[PDB]
């Protein structure tokens, strides 16, 4: 199929590894820690020790053969800097790495990493919005301004009708889906019942949907 | 207005901290690295040096008047576990902790945790699955079988109408939003075009948009 | 039978372990510094060298099939609260703890000990009543207000008998028992007579006994 | 009144302090530790930072004028010595001694220390004895052979009469006390009744209250 | 006349402004040491305080308008790599680095330092080829096979004249320089003579000047 | 051959082994930090683990053999001196050792080291005078006054002829080398031309040679 | 012979392990520092590592079979004081201790040694001695007011004669010894020679020795 | 009078400088550590805080004009080497300095100490003379072979004459002074008696001195 390789089997390479084994790619697992490689030896085609900053093991890895290599090494820059270093030298089409700060980032950069991900700032960035509200569950941004979001049904709108509860022309948004205890209503018609607690799916602008926060529920 | 206070400034935390604080919140940045506090001083209300396992400093810290107290400490275990436990003796409302492992969150579960995050082990499995398809940008699960899909549009869908496109009924898929060149077209018409390189947000069945990236796109 | 285990060879713990096994009971003594667990050797059935905050270790020492086990760390919190916790996970029957202040009490509360000793607090209150009152060598409280007390008898009551000092009405409290050169009599009659420096049994309120120590000595 | 000096607010020491005070005593309370003596300045008539090592600071602390001097100091056996010596020099009537080992005993003897106390050994020895026998929850040691036991009543006791109960002729040892739901009973008659889960007092031998606890509870 | 800026004021950047500023330059001393700023201050036109990693500091020392930049810190790799992106970043013309290992040297490359020097590295190599050979002083290759040297004259080449040691036919090298008491006489003639302890400066091919080592002196 | 000991595999040192392995050299490679041994293990005859101030190790090194002896530690000061101590007692003919400051280089004196060279100070000298006069390549002082340079040619000197440019009569120097397209002329004649770009290797003083840079190229 | 136990290889319990050693006596030479039990394993019996502190390890010395016992810890004084105490109780004939200060010296002293001494205090005293006072080389009190004292000659004595140096007459002392050039003359004939920077050692009282120094050199 | 400068108020350094301050003579007590200065301040004319490694500081002391300065730092060789350089380059007429080892030795002597003493060594070599031989109270060696020995008195020496003790002939030394009482004999004719526990001056060879010890007493 397709060919990856994740280094550094940390909680976000590992999960990586894991989750991309679980879709039945061919995953190779390299990690210069001894008991992470016994660790997730269930959950890759080979996993393997090896030190990604010497070249020669690298080398015996046959890591030129792989589409897509991933560098989860974020806690030693040296280490994961020089790594993708040596990954790009070897000419690897996509190398994606994890990066710690803002100057790690910059380096990566510069050496030329495909991908650069700050899993932690960015999961941060979301619980800190699920934080000052609630209400919110979950949410993806379309742009700057455009939004899909996921709120938690409150009181003020139990047994409230999807035409009771006018977003369409009164907030300029539109609601999407209804789950109402773990059962799933796509694209609801008007007649629909949202009862509280329930998970309701809206979209718009961001300050819309706010306002529908704010005077709505 | 709301009380926020982040122990353990990592990555995550540090990020959760510096948003908040950009949101206009009163955050509390604590930290036992001084070298922590020193630097996102510039980003919270007040930064304090204190071992949060030590409890004499956590009510020199006067942590019982905050709604919502952030543990982020996620490599440490043992610390993350004796600070939740404290926090919750301390009878604080809103408890979020970050976990490492499937057993630390049953620790911090038991103890009672008020909401657990695990942000590389997630993240992880998001960027897997814009691993396997390169088309998938971003995404978010309504449930273990529903979600809402954005992709990256090849040249099998330029210049395709919606209506030509009919994912309403030949995958029971439904599709919300276009993106092209930075402009956004929500909930769009069965007339309107997409041309390839677009951001297109498909809404459905897990499997099902799978179907139509195969055999459509 | 029934194993006792002595985690922390303390001056406490190390005291629990060395007359437990003068009673002969199986006692296992575990301790990480070994200089401890080379000390109590002689006085248990099994000394160990153990990190019982590590989990492989706890059950290398086999504990889950003991019937009591004693925490008797009270300086380092940390490890207390994980070896309790590990404790109470491996479904130990009787979990008691020694504790260091209100709060370490507490979150060995939560965490569900079984009983939670203070050593130092106790012991102090029982001095400092021997303090305030130079004549009480000991004593046990029954209650809030109710207490068999043991005094040290003065020249006041040198040569004086049980019914010569009418404690039974004139003051509501019983004498028990009278201790004279390592001789002892328990319950004594009324005609026997209690010479100086003898120890004096006597039972009653609080405020009372205080009032015969007062008038009477 | 009487002029008590406590120095090291450890438990032990705050202990002693603090119930001192609730006796209404003059007590002053030293500690190297700021934060301690900050702890226990509501528990004490005089709450002075200073390193009791130090003769200047001693004598700043006017500490000759006091009857009874105690140094709770009880891990860094150096400095218990060193003050000991020092309030010795000063010619102080009464210096108790908290000790750790037999060794700081011994240092402490030669140099002339009025009381040495083990609270963690002696509490370790009664908590033990509470363990090998449930039924104990108290107890005070008359003497090598003799002693007054507090019990806590099993089903075997539950509604019968002292007079049923005959520990004074069956068993040699006598009743002296029942404790129910925090009601209290002083020396009571043959007709009253124990109910389980209740506080026993008898009085007696050792193997005959043991004897009784056998056959009896 | 030419501005330069020397950050990191070591061994060898404090060597560069030091010379430097002996020469007549504009020399900016620049150090987050304050006591290297006070030792340079003598020694440069302007010496400052300044976190050079802290981009706003480095628009506090206007160094935008510098035409050279010496980044002289050596062993902390990420501040100089961090203050090299900077200045690259700044547009700077001429970015001078200190390297500390062969990967800090690639990604100083890679980042776009204009020239990378290894100055012990280099010297070792220098003072290595003094060790295997005690009679030179100094020398400069003019390529991989050809080469000048300075030699230290020894006792076989006392009283000895040009035309007696006939380098020019026998050994193919030509002597070019005569350093006798500090005197010196540049490209003399053949009657000229040669005294040990002398500086004697051949120029030729390596082996050949060597052969002459050999046979010669 | 001839038996080098370098001590301390630093840069300075580690290039100094490597060097003179390359040359084909006994090279005893010395450092107390395995991975520096473990480093240069392929760079020298023979790499040991070693504390260089502890003389039953250096003994078991068997230095006393050596003839050359290179400390190559010049940040410990403490370390580089006593090793060097320890190898003047061991009568060590040849004592070379790296030094950090004055002071260092003081007590290395005293104490008889044979050769002290500070590399970063020197080299910072040389990149100094490179730095102030952007034209030299490379070049050796034969005194304070008089020196050898080698120049990069400008457009300024392309087929320009040896006697047109007459350095031996209008400014006092002496061309002694050219360097075209890598092949080389050894002390040219009159007639040769020089092409731009190529090595110019002059001779005289250094005032000099700065006049013939100024007008004649 | 006699058997001594040497515990601490400081430099005054080397001194004296290595002395004794020399005159050949069964010394046990006692250390917990490893290389320090490596180092002075030529100059002794039996050379162990232990922890003097520990008992069961002082048994597993033997220690009791010793007649002296030489505690040369005068740096940690809990280390010094225990093991004193230790032999003590093991009744050891003769305890030595080596003290710091003058109440480390009062805590030997009431745990019973049997001799305490200061060697840098005593030996200062000396050194100071010789500091006032150029001329004294060395000296032994044979009371308060007599003595003998070793002189360096001065150029007022140079060429002198014993006969011509009346002191038996002039200055009521005696010359009993005369070190020239290393050669040594015992109880000197009146014919006898004094030449300058010559050891002098005379005899008598301390006033009249000084003022043979003053009249006579 | 003369001057001293006491520099490392240690145990040594400190008996130095106040035994030299009791003859009364001008010394200054010089300390890094606050509380030396402060403890030595009675014992001193003046003591000062400085760094005696810092020139600066050793300047702002003034000590070019003093006579003698004392190095008494022992455990820290490198700030002693440091200072002990430093007075020498300031020309100091008498550096005296305590020395550790004898590589410290050694880098004191190279840097020209005028004086290196080893009190601890010395001392120890005195208490382990005193240890093999409980009789000798005193003594002074005039050479390695020869010395002066103080002894006491044993019951084989009581109501002895000196004709009667033959030491001159049969084992080649001489007596020199016998103490009786505290009453003092000074070279004592052969009439006189030598009683039991009285002081006795012997002197001579070692070895015959040990032989007189052997077989006289
Ligand atoms: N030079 C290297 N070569 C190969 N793998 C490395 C190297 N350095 C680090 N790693 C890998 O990184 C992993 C550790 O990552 P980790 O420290 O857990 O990240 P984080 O601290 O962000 O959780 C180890 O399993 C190790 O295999
Ligand atoms: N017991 C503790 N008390 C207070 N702070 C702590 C404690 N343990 C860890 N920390 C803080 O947590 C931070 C480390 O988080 P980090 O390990 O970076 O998270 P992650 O591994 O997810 O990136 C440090 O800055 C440290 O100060
Ligand atoms: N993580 C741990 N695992 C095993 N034993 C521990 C751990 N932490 C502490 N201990 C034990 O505690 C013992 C000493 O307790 P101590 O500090 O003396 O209590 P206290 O200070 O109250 O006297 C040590 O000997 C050690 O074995
Ligand atoms: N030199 C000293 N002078 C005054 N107080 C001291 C000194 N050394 C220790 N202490 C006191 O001892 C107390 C700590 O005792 P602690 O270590 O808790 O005993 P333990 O560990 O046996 O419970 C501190 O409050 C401190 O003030
Ligand atoms: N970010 C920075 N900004 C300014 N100066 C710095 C920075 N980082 C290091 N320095 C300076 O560099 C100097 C250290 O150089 P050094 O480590 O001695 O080089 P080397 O190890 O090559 O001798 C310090 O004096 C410090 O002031
Ligand atoms: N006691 C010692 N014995 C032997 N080698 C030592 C000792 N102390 C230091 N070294 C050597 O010094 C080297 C480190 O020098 P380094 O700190 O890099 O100097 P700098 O910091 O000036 O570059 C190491 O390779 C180590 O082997
Ligand atoms: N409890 C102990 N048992 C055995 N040896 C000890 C003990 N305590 C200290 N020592 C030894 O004493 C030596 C240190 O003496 P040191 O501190 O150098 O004396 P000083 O400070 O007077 O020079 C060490 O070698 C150590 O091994
Ligand atoms: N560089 C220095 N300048 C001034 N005083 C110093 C310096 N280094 C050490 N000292 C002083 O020397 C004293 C330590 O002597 P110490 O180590 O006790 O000698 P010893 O080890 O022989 O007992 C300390 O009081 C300290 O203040």
Redesign the interface.
């Given at each position: 199929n397709?060919q990856?390789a994740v280094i550094g089997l940390?909680?976000?390479?590992?999960?990586?590894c894991?989750?991309?084994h679980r879709?039945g790619?061919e995953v190779l697992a390299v990690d210069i820690n001894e008991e992470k490689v016994n660790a997730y030896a269930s959950y890759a085609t080979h996993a393997v020790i090896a030190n990604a900053t010497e070249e020669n093991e690298l080398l015996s890895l046959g890591i030129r053969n792989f589409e897509?290599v991933?560098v989860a090494i974020?806690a030693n820059?040296?280490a994961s800097?020089?790594t993708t270093?040596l990954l790009k030298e070897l000419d690897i089409p996509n190398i994606?790495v994890k990066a710690?700060?803002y100057?790690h980032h910059?380096?990566l950069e510069?050496?030329?990493a495909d991908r650069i991900?700050?899993?932690?700032?960015?999961?941060?960035?979301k619980?800190?919005?699920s934080?000052?509200d609630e209400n919110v569950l979950?949410?993806?941004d379309?742009?700057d301004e455009?939004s899909?979001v996921?709120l938690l049904a409150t009181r003020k709108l139990d047994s409230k009708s999807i035409i009771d509860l006018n977003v369409r022309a009164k907030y300029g948004c539109?609601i999407?889906?209804i789950?109402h205890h773990?059962d799933?209503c796509?694209?609801p018609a008007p007649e629909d019942i949202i009862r509280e607690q329930d998970?309701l799916?809206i979209?718009?602008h961001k300050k819309d949907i706010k306002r529908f926060e704010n005077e709505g529920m």
């Open positions: 397709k990856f940390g909680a976000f390479g590992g999960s990586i894991k989750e991309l879709m790619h897509y991933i974020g820059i040296q800097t020089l270093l994606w710690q700060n100057y910059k380096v510069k050496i030329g991900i700050h899993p932690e700032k960015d999961m941060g960035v619980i800190a919005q934080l000052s979950n949410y993806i379309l742009s455009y899909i996921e539109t999407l889906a789950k773990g799933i796509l694209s998970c799916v979209m718009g």
